[PDB]
Amino acid sequence: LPPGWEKAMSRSSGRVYYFNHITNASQWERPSEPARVRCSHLLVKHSQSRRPSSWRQEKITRTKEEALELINGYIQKIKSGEEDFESLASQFSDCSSAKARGDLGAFSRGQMQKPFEDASFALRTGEMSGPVFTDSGIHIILRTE
Numbered sequence: 001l002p003p004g005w006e007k008a009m010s011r012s013s014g015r016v017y018y019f020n021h022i023t024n025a026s027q028w029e030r031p032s033e034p035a036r037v038r039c040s041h042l043l044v045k046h047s048q049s050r051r052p053s054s055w056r057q058e059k060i061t062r063t064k065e066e067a068l069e070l071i072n073g074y075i076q077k078i079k080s081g082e083e084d085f086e087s088l089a090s091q092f093s094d095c096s097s098a099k100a101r102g103d104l105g106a107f108s109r110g111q112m113q114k115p116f117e118d119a120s121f122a123l124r125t126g127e128m129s130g131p132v133f134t135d136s137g138i139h140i141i142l143r144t145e
């Protein structure tokens, strides 16, 4: 299995699935390192963020648990096709990158905070992470290159 992936059993159905502890991604199908990657992200901040403030809200008051619920909801809508990642990032990401539909550009290792970097370089091109925690809040990451 590729880096970070493990086989697991669904609680509701008992069917095998696959989970990546680095990206917190999960998928039913059996999954299939570059010097640089390009990623977009959607950040949801919370009251314990290092700077609980964004262009959306001067004082961010939601709890970390409420932020995780929002992230889970965005992931659901992206995976169902009801919304696309870029549209949700433009509207709801607590970050100046929202104006660029979440695009952070390309980077190598040594530039991003390690949890974000590790998830970014463990994703396949076009793959999306689960919730990824940094001191600023909770991210969804989309590897675009």
Ligand SMILES: *CC(=O)N1Cc2[nH]c3ccccc3c2C[C@H]1C(=O)N1CCCC[C@H]1C(=O)N[C@@H](Cc1c[nH]c2ccc(F)cc12)C(N)=O
Pocket: 041, 043, 094, 095, 096, 097, 100, 103, 104, 105, 106, 107, 111, 112, 113, 116, 134, 136
């Ligand atoms: C909101 C947020 O998470 N930002 C703000 C931001 N807006 C951008 C617009 C265009 C390109 C890059 C942008 C960023 C950077 C980002 C941020 O603070 N991040 C990125 C996601 C993980 C956590 C955190 C960091 O890891 N920041 C870097 C320092 C840093 C700041 N700006 C950049 C740009 C590129 C880069 F490679 C690194 C950057 C860190 N703490 O090491």
